[PDB]
Amino acid sequence: EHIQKVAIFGGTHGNELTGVFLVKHWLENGAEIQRTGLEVKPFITNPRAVKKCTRYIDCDLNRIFDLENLGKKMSEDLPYEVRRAQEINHLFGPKDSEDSYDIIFDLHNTTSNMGCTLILEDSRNNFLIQMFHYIKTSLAPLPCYVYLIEHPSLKYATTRSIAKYPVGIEVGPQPQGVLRADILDQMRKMIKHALDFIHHFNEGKEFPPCAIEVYKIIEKVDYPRDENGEIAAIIHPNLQDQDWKPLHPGDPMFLTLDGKTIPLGGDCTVYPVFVNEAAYYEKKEAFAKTTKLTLNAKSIRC
Amino acid sequence: EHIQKVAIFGGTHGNELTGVFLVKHWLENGAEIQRTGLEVKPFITNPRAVKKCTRYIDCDLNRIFDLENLGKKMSEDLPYEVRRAQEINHLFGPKDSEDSYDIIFDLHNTTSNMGCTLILEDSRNNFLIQMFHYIKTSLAPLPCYVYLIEHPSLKYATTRSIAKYPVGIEVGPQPQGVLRADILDQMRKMIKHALDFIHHFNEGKEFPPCAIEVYKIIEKVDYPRDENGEIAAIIHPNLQDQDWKPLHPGDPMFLTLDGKTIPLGGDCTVYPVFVNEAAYYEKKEAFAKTTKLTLNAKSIRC
Ligand SMILES: [Zn+2]
Ligand SMILES: [Zn+2]
């Protein structure tokens, strides 16, 4: 299998402007994202949310590419993002069809101090592991992590799950509604390597069995809450900005205004991720706990 | 025993969480902001914007405290904030009247790397120049910076301007809708010193003359724009995060996606502030130019 149809999504969330800015540039002069023998389409997924420069209009677009939403009768009555979701599935899918696109990169941003991050939706997918191994290794010494999202009741119905091979791209720290240049540079480098991988894959290159480190999600921790549901403590200074780095039972986790430290607890070291994400205030979450495990890929061919 | 009425406003902008959080705490336990012989009211100015974690509902509350809005007949058609401003004005004013609050602190956050910032509205105000000198001195060796908004033109109209002695407290960088512990420690300390000053002054402690460096707004700078009026370049990596530091005629300012470097130009040195402030994308602006000038205060007693 050669890859034929590659797309780059920007503006899934309208106030994550790195994607929006790159995608809008690339819809004018696309040279950067083409490769000899490869044809890739840039696309703004949520134009309404990008105009208002807001996360979403009626509901989060990045949580609805599932059966419950993609298979309901089209009606101007529907929440905007649902109408949009079908519009996108019909363009780049349909999801779970042989006709759907081969790879979609879906570009995101985070207020968390994560750096260049790749999101894996299938720990068994050998083509994705090889891609991600390629992107990590290439980027060095620029740090780059892989966030693993299966399992088994907690998976999201994402925009890029339309593809046979879904690829999430997150780069942080960045405030929402801010275009930073370091971040934009890092994101354009990640894509550069991703698109060069696909190009090498097509040209017939073999990749030897490889091994990458991933961080598998396990549990989302919410903030200590009040007898109302108001946040009662904040992310401890010592945990702030320490995404990916080991957090041990003893370690400070939250801090109250009165000054008291609330520690981790539990049996083992976890690796905090999305520490203090703007978007997860609403959704009740301070960060996600992840375990550090190794994924091995078998060799791959043209 | 002169200064009697003091208010600490929080959540003028709903998505700036630090003020929102401190005021909310202090409503339950005000001990931190009490000073013997001194009564201090904390207050959420924009509850509706807070609830939605949004900057404003209909218009920006921090720019409508003028004759035009404050003096129009109360109605339901009027924007949410207009109607709120008249309430806050009847509660803590009326503005320009003897029986308005003496001092108001209005707590803000910026996405710019600015550190502790005090906002001075009146360069001839001996009282405020002393308060600012006191806070500066008390905070040392932690930097504290004074921003002076006097023109003619470029002036609001602010929520605090209700008071005889308005004071604006701005702490950054923090992403909108996020609540960093470090940022909350700095605003706290700032407020601690401000209330101490007022307490020292009321107890007839004399202050000798002093001098502070302030930074005068001279011009807002917009991003280079498109054919259709889009941002065509971004804040240069060199200029990113360098608020308050000097910028020079030949110095890099904006970077294009190419990336071409757009230099400063002009023939004098300037001091950027609000560099890459999220709230100013909408308002068509990239940073403010300021000039660094020294201000004097005569001595003050009572
Ligand atoms: Zn996103
Ligand atoms: Zn503000």
XYZ file of C-alpha atoms and ligand atoms in Angstrom:
606
model
C 0.000 0.000 0.000
C 1.273 3.368 -1.200
C -0.234 6.450 0.442
C -2.304 8.546 -1.960
C -4.453 10.897 0.078
C -2.906 13.015 2.825
C -4.610 16.025 4.443
C -3.529 18.636 7.006
C -6.304 19.897 9.261
C -6.136 23.290 10.935
C -8.603 25.100 13.181
C -10.369 22.106 14.669
C -10.464 24.430 17.652
C -10.725 28.016 16.468
C -8.473 29.679 19.054
C -5.459 27.390 18.380
C -3.891 29.625 15.811
C -0.737 27.781 14.812
C -2.754 25.335 12.715
C -5.025 28.086 11.421
C -2.063 30.223 10.398
C -0.122 27.421 8.673
C -3.185 25.974 6.943
C -4.258 29.420 5.644
C -0.730 30.065 4.340
C -0.650 26.627 2.693
C -3.986 27.236 0.976
C -2.224 30.119 -0.817
C 1.230 28.725 -1.632
C 1.235 24.989 -0.989
C 4.788 24.149 -2.065
C 5.986 23.382 1.484
C 3.566 20.494 2.050
C 3.904 18.812 -1.356
C 6.469 16.120 -2.097
C 7.351 14.625 -5.490
C 4.655 11.948 -5.956
C 2.605 13.021 -2.936
C -0.450 15.308 -3.020
C -1.577 16.777 0.354
C -4.627 18.995 0.991
C -4.657 21.757 3.662
C -8.054 22.477 5.213
C -9.713 24.619 7.878
C -12.053 22.329 9.751
C -13.914 24.953 11.779
C -14.187 28.277 9.906
C -16.997 29.624 12.155
C -14.901 29.094 15.286
C -11.775 30.555 13.652
C -13.664 33.741 12.796
C -14.879 34.262 16.351
C -11.424 33.054 17.467
C -13.083 30.783 19.985
C -12.723 27.074 20.809
C -16.084 26.017 19.303
C -19.532 27.405 18.520
C -22.054 24.912 19.878
C -20.005 21.890 20.954
C -16.451 20.588 20.598
C -15.856 19.438 17.004
C -13.035 17.140 18.135
C -15.286 14.805 20.165
C -18.089 14.054 17.687
C -16.812 12.040 14.725
C -18.755 9.012 15.882
C -21.894 7.165 14.905
C -24.180 9.102 17.276
C -23.407 12.333 15.390
C -22.242 11.446 11.874
C -25.427 9.492 11.117
C -28.239 11.939 11.860
C -30.506 13.624 9.292
C -28.994 16.930 8.161
C -30.996 19.879 9.507
C -30.141 23.572 9.871
C -31.551 22.854 13.361
C -28.453 20.835 14.357
C -25.590 22.170 16.479
C -23.213 23.859 14.042
C -20.237 21.533 14.668
C -22.448 18.474 14.035
C -23.478 19.936 10.636
C -19.792 20.620 10.060
C -18.718 17.141 11.180
C -20.861 15.491 8.496
C -19.629 18.018 5.910
C -16.085 16.885 6.734
C -16.812 13.155 6.887
C -18.348 13.353 3.394
C -15.297 15.274 2.151
C -12.449 13.350 3.758
C -14.131 10.083 4.713
C -16.524 8.530 5.134
C -15.019 7.131 8.366
C -14.432 3.332 8.152
C -14.524 3.286 4.328
C -11.788 2.159 1.921
C -12.446 5.489 0.172
C -11.598 7.598 3.210
C -8.282 9.455 3.279
C -5.115 7.538 4.150
C -3.583 9.978 6.666
C -4.898 13.121 8.336
C -2.676 15.316 10.471
C -4.893 17.269 12.840
C -2.956 20.280 14.319
C -3.596 21.421 17.853
C -2.123 23.652 20.527
C -1.944 23.516 24.308
C -1.318 25.940 27.185
C 0.539 23.012 28.811
C 4.311 22.840 28.652
C 4.440 19.766 26.442
C 6.665 20.688 23.511
C 6.306 18.752 20.274
C 3.779 16.026 20.845
C 2.351 13.201 18.738
C -0.902 11.439 19.603
C -1.306 7.748 18.911
C -4.828 6.226 18.744
C -3.736 2.612 18.103
C -0.792 1.123 19.990
C -0.725 -1.836 17.588
C -0.470 0.179 14.344
C 3.034 -0.577 13.014
C 2.942 2.172 10.339
C 2.279 4.877 12.947
C 4.986 3.705 15.335
C 7.494 3.841 12.472
C 6.350 7.338 11.463
C 6.556 8.545 15.074
C 9.973 6.945 15.579
C 11.073 8.811 12.450
C 9.676 12.166 13.575
C 11.108 11.915 17.160
C 14.568 10.849 16.015
C 14.711 13.468 13.260
C 13.662 16.270 15.620
C 16.353 15.587 18.236
C 17.767 17.140 20.250
C 14.452 18.954 20.067
C 12.372 16.946 22.615
C 9.323 15.093 21.243
C 6.837 12.864 23.076
C 4.148 10.367 22.056
C 0.859 10.449 23.958
C -1.030 7.125 23.791
C -4.848 7.346 24.040
C -6.521 3.907 23.689
C -7.997 2.334 26.065
C -11.107 0.886 25.869
C -13.984 3.048 27.177
C -12.039 6.362 27.284
C -11.172 6.878 23.571
C -12.197 10.130 21.849
C -14.181 10.400 18.555
C -11.707 12.788 16.989
C -11.638 14.786 13.769
C -8.645 12.847 12.402
C -10.193 9.421 13.157
C -11.804 9.856 9.728
C -8.485 8.682 8.238
C -7.226 5.114 8.120
C -4.115 6.528 9.844
C -5.055 9.304 12.374
C -2.204 11.634 13.540
C -2.687 14.288 16.196
C -0.149 17.097 16.413
C 0.083 19.193 19.560
C 2.651 21.861 20.430
C 2.737 23.878 23.704
C 3.022 26.053 25.789
C 0.886 28.629 24.057
C -1.998 30.768 25.287
C -5.169 30.354 23.244
C -5.582 33.175 20.738
C -1.806 33.753 20.662
C 0.457 33.161 17.674
C 3.990 32.471 18.976
C 6.954 31.991 16.581
C 8.874 29.273 18.477
C 5.719 27.124 18.529
C 5.011 27.784 14.859
C 8.580 26.819 14.059
C 8.321 23.531 15.998
C 4.992 22.637 14.432
C 6.246 23.291 10.932
C 9.244 21.032 11.683
C 7.104 18.144 12.925
C 5.065 18.235 9.685
C 8.222 18.509 7.574
C 9.411 15.210 9.059
C 5.993 13.544 8.891
C 5.629 14.398 5.203
C 9.243 13.259 4.497
C 8.496 9.971 6.184
C 5.493 9.237 3.949
C 7.662 10.227 0.993
C 10.418 7.781 1.976
C 7.795 5.091 2.664
C 6.359 5.487 -0.843
C 9.744 5.578 -2.609
C 10.174 2.007 -1.376
C 12.390 2.381 1.696
C 12.418 -0.408 4.284
C 12.454 0.428 7.998
C 14.031 -2.043 10.489
C 11.986 -3.164 13.533
C 12.100 -0.205 15.934
C 11.144 0.867 19.453
C 9.618 4.094 20.785
C 8.634 5.300 24.216
C 5.022 6.250 24.813
C 2.977 7.618 27.664
C -0.272 5.718 27.999
C -3.176 7.595 29.555
C -4.675 5.928 32.650
C -6.850 8.383 34.611
C -7.798 12.085 34.512
C -7.487 13.865 37.857
C -9.887 16.726 38.566
C -9.028 19.656 40.860
C -10.046 19.465 44.488
C -13.527 20.970 44.345
C -15.616 22.984 46.837
C -18.937 22.021 48.389
C -20.308 23.804 45.260
C -18.045 22.526 42.474
C -15.706 25.526 42.469
C -11.937 24.734 42.270
C -10.543 24.588 45.824
C -6.820 24.183 45.072
C -4.499 24.951 42.173
C -1.651 23.122 40.366
C 1.333 23.199 42.711
C 4.194 25.423 41.548
C 6.526 22.355 41.503
C 4.187 20.435 39.179
C 3.382 23.456 36.956
C 5.205 23.211 33.582
C 6.565 19.713 34.462
C 4.579 17.691 31.931
C 6.115 14.330 30.989
C 8.379 14.357 34.088
C 7.971 11.663 36.794
C 5.669 12.452 39.766
C 6.094 10.196 42.850
C 3.515 9.464 45.640
C 5.337 11.855 48.005
C 5.424 14.742 45.506
C 3.471 18.057 45.727
C 0.528 18.097 43.327
C -1.865 20.845 44.417
C -1.587 23.987 46.538
C -4.350 25.834 48.365
C -4.605 29.582 48.966
C -4.175 28.882 52.688
C -0.803 27.490 51.660
C -1.255 23.764 52.210
C 0.273 21.188 49.853
C -1.829 18.236 48.598
C 0.413 15.308 47.556
C -0.101 12.515 45.029
C -0.841 9.315 46.987
C -1.342 5.906 45.393
C 1.173 3.137 44.764
C 3.580 4.357 42.061
C 5.295 6.991 39.927
C 3.077 8.545 37.254
C 3.960 10.886 34.384
C 1.728 14.006 34.362
C 0.438 15.331 31.023
C -1.713 18.347 29.985
C -0.789 19.944 33.287
C -2.961 23.022 33.593
C -4.640 23.073 30.195
C -7.054 25.968 29.697
C -9.524 23.719 27.876
C -9.769 21.177 30.670
C -11.110 23.571 33.276
C -14.644 23.200 31.902
C -14.278 19.410 31.371
C -13.182 18.874 35.071
C -9.433 17.932 34.829
C -6.166 19.282 36.216
C -4.029 16.906 34.129
C -3.881 13.310 32.879
C -1.867 10.584 34.611
C 0.148 8.441 32.224
C 2.268 5.298 32.536
C 5.531 5.096 30.591
C 5.582 1.998 28.372
C 7.561 0.818 25.299
C 6.114 0.030 21.888
C 7.874 -2.203 19.375
C 7.130 -2.034 15.644
C 7.747 -4.747 13.079
C 9.554 -3.786 9.857
C 7.576 -2.069 7.043
C 7.736 -1.896 3.207
C 6.416 0.078 0.121
C -6.550 58.677 59.351
C -7.455 60.050 55.862
C -7.908 56.956 53.562
C -11.110 55.155 54.589
C -12.791 53.372 51.642
C -10.845 50.662 49.756
C -12.035 48.075 47.202
C -10.224 45.254 45.398
C -12.030 44.489 42.163
C -11.685 41.084 40.547
C -12.896 39.577 37.301
C -13.380 42.788 35.317
C -12.420 40.496 32.458
C -13.995 37.086 33.025
C -11.177 34.983 31.583
C -8.439 36.557 33.779
C -8.648 34.115 36.637
C -6.188 35.367 39.252
C -8.274 38.352 40.422
C -11.352 36.136 40.163
C -9.765 33.609 42.455
C -8.316 35.900 45.089
C -11.462 38.013 45.478
C -13.584 34.854 45.754
C -11.330 33.532 48.523
C -11.321 36.864 50.371
C -15.143 37.025 50.335
C -15.121 33.880 52.475
C -12.094 34.946 54.564
C -10.997 38.591 54.336
C -8.216 38.424 56.967
C -5.441 38.765 54.330
C -6.786 42.078 53.027
C -7.816 43.628 56.379
C -5.509 46.112 58.081
C -6.262 47.322 61.586
C -8.105 50.670 61.320
C -8.884 49.907 57.626
C -12.048 48.479 55.951
C -11.432 46.685 52.571
C -14.250 45.374 50.315
C -13.446 42.684 47.698
C -15.797 42.416 44.727
C -16.403 40.597 41.479
C -17.165 43.248 38.894
C -18.252 41.007 35.989
C -20.047 37.887 37.390
C -21.652 37.067 34.052
C -18.350 37.066 32.157
C -16.725 35.079 34.957
C -19.464 32.395 34.767
C -18.847 31.929 31.044
C -15.054 32.293 31.514
C -15.083 34.923 28.798
C -13.483 38.392 28.531
C -16.863 40.191 28.170
C -20.524 39.441 27.307
C -21.496 42.385 25.090
C -18.762 45.006 25.424
C -15.553 45.498 27.397
C -16.441 46.597 30.938
C -13.048 48.201 31.439
C -13.688 50.948 28.902
C -17.211 52.340 29.474
C -16.910 54.307 32.737
C -17.469 57.702 31.207
C -20.184 60.281 31.030
C -21.633 58.729 27.879
C -22.395 55.294 29.364
C -22.531 56.089 33.078
C -25.131 58.792 32.544
C -27.626 57.191 30.121
C -31.107 56.137 31.296
C -31.215 52.538 32.592
C -33.031 50.079 30.315
C -32.998 46.393 29.212
C -31.854 46.959 25.621
C -28.534 48.369 26.875
C -25.572 45.941 26.625
C -24.911 43.770 29.719
C -21.802 45.656 30.771
C -23.244 49.139 30.284
C -25.968 48.163 32.763
C -23.389 46.587 35.139
C -21.181 49.689 35.016
C -24.000 51.884 36.329
C -24.443 49.415 39.237
C -20.750 49.345 40.108
C -20.814 53.119 39.819
C -23.729 53.507 42.228
C -22.082 50.945 44.533
C -18.475 52.220 44.658
C -18.802 55.743 43.246
C -20.400 57.812 41.966
C -17.319 58.578 39.859
C -15.827 62.091 40.488
C -17.764 62.537 43.701
C -16.290 63.074 47.169
C -18.150 60.069 48.570
C -16.829 57.537 46.101
C -14.279 54.948 47.156
C -10.868 56.479 47.907
C -8.753 53.681 46.346
C -9.645 50.836 44.012
C -7.359 48.003 42.940
C -8.453 46.299 39.745
C -6.695 42.973 39.207
C -5.766 41.828 35.717
C -3.690 39.205 33.913
C -1.866 39.520 30.602
C -0.542 36.795 28.267
C 2.579 38.941 27.851
C 5.799 38.322 29.753
C 5.490 41.465 31.899
C 5.880 40.402 35.516
C 4.388 42.582 38.242
C 2.876 45.661 36.596
C 1.329 48.752 38.212
C -0.786 50.989 36.009
C -0.603 54.685 36.695
C -3.300 56.904 35.227
C -2.054 60.285 36.459
C 1.613 61.360 36.351
C 1.076 64.298 38.759
C -0.539 62.134 41.422
C 1.882 62.359 44.356
C -0.013 59.738 46.395
C 0.126 57.009 43.729
C 3.760 57.630 42.786
C 4.558 57.022 46.472
C 2.446 53.883 46.680
C 4.160 52.568 43.580
C 7.590 53.455 45.012
C 6.664 51.588 48.139
C 5.530 48.470 46.320
C 8.600 48.529 44.087
C 10.920 48.828 47.089
C 9.112 46.151 49.117
C 9.123 43.657 46.191
C 12.845 43.971 45.485
C 14.784 42.060 44.170
C 11.706 40.906 42.244
C 11.108 43.441 39.406
C 7.964 45.581 39.416
C 7.108 47.862 36.519
C 5.053 51.013 36.114
C 3.013 51.674 33.019
C 1.724 55.184 32.489
C -1.346 55.733 30.316
C -1.578 59.491 29.735
C -1.881 61.103 26.316
C -4.174 63.370 25.083
C -5.923 60.508 23.204
C -5.226 56.817 24.024
C -7.176 56.577 27.337
C -10.142 54.644 28.813
C -12.621 54.960 30.863
C -11.724 52.177 33.316
C -13.628 50.395 36.085
C -11.154 51.647 38.726
C -11.328 55.262 37.534
C -14.408 55.381 39.766
C -11.951 55.968 42.648
C -10.105 59.175 43.626
C -6.941 57.040 43.428
C -7.363 54.273 40.808
C -4.747 51.482 40.778
C -4.420 48.764 38.175
C -2.608 45.564 39.010
C -1.492 43.516 36.021
C 0.425 40.241 36.356
C 1.752 38.120 33.423
C 2.400 35.897 31.500
C -0.578 33.655 32.117
C -2.700 32.077 29.481
C -6.289 33.358 29.558
C -8.552 30.951 31.403
C -5.570 29.414 33.290
C -4.671 29.812 36.974
C -0.893 29.641 37.613
C 0.260 29.445 41.237
C 3.389 31.573 40.698
C 1.247 34.397 39.147
C -1.096 34.193 42.113
C 1.814 34.464 44.546
C 3.007 37.663 42.817
C -0.382 39.453 42.773
C -0.804 38.481 46.433
C 2.545 40.038 47.405
C 1.739 43.102 45.325
C -1.547 43.579 47.138
C 0.107 42.897 50.510
C 2.491 45.807 49.986
C -0.149 48.164 48.641
C -2.348 47.638 51.686
C 0.709 48.044 53.938
C 1.452 51.387 52.335
C -2.086 52.637 52.968
C -1.765 51.404 56.541
C 1.608 53.147 57.023
C 0.245 56.407 55.544
C -2.897 56.441 57.723
C -0.687 56.113 60.765
C 0.975 59.430 59.923
C 4.252 57.892 58.803
C 5.894 60.549 56.587
C 7.316 59.657 53.176
C 10.243 61.711 51.778
C 10.374 62.569 48.075
C 11.028 59.702 45.646
C 11.626 58.914 41.991
C 10.298 56.020 39.958
C 10.876 54.933 36.374
C 7.642 54.736 34.464
C 6.932 53.687 30.865
C 4.754 56.079 28.881
C 2.422 54.791 26.149
C 3.252 56.669 22.947
C 1.813 54.430 20.183
C 0.114 51.101 19.606
C 1.633 49.022 16.809
C -0.565 46.766 14.645
C 0.610 43.615 12.899
C 1.421 43.872 9.192
C -1.850 43.172 7.399
C -3.015 41.251 4.281
C -4.893 42.151 1.121
C -8.081 41.194 3.028
C -6.681 42.656 6.295
C -5.222 39.465 7.866
C -2.087 39.274 10.046
C 0.716 38.803 7.510
C 3.599 38.353 9.992
C 4.079 37.393 13.638
C 5.985 38.872 16.609
C 9.663 38.003 16.036
C 11.221 35.315 18.331
C 13.703 37.969 19.556
C 10.902 40.348 20.549
C 8.692 37.582 21.958
C 8.753 37.629 25.747
C 11.026 40.694 25.916
C 8.563 43.260 27.272
C 10.177 46.266 28.957
C 13.574 45.539 27.377
C 14.851 48.164 24.914
C 14.255 47.752 21.188
C 16.434 49.625 18.662
C 15.797 50.993 15.108
C 17.647 48.050 13.460
C 16.109 45.451 15.765
C 13.952 42.487 14.577
C 10.244 43.002 15.279
C 8.015 40.829 13.077
C 8.729 37.564 11.268
C 6.830 36.277 8.185
C 6.184 32.579 7.528
C 9.023 32.734 4.948
C 10.612 34.025 7.064
C 11.513 37.600 6.229
C 12.476 39.712 9.282
C 10.756 43.080 9.550
C 13.022 45.452 11.566
C 11.850 48.300 13.838
C 12.636 51.472 11.868
C 12.195 55.014 13.114
C 15.232 56.741 14.635
C 14.886 56.282 18.408
C 14.894 53.497 21.017
C 11.516 52.243 22.293
C 10.239 49.923 25.062
C 7.663 47.308 23.964
C 4.998 46.310 26.449
C 1.883 44.144 26.019
C 4.035 42.237 23.497
C 1.837 39.536 22.025
C -1.145 40.244 24.283
C -4.048 38.007 23.283
C -6.753 40.613 23.969
C -5.155 42.917 21.381
C -5.486 40.663 18.318
C -9.161 41.676 18.061
C -8.277 45.326 18.766
C -5.897 45.176 15.720
C -2.577 45.569 17.728
C 0.764 43.753 18.320
C 2.396 45.789 21.112
C 2.532 49.272 22.659
C 5.607 51.481 22.245
C 6.621 53.227 25.447
C 9.295 55.698 26.428
C 11.126 55.299 29.724
C 10.882 58.421 31.819
C 11.533 59.255 35.486
C 8.782 60.712 37.647
C 9.010 62.645 40.900
C 6.797 62.720 43.939
C 6.790 65.484 46.548
C 6.694 64.117 50.096
C 3.356 63.089 51.656
C 1.885 62.817 55.210
C -1.196 62.289 57.463
Zn -7.124 21.469 20.152
Zn -7.787 42.643 31.893
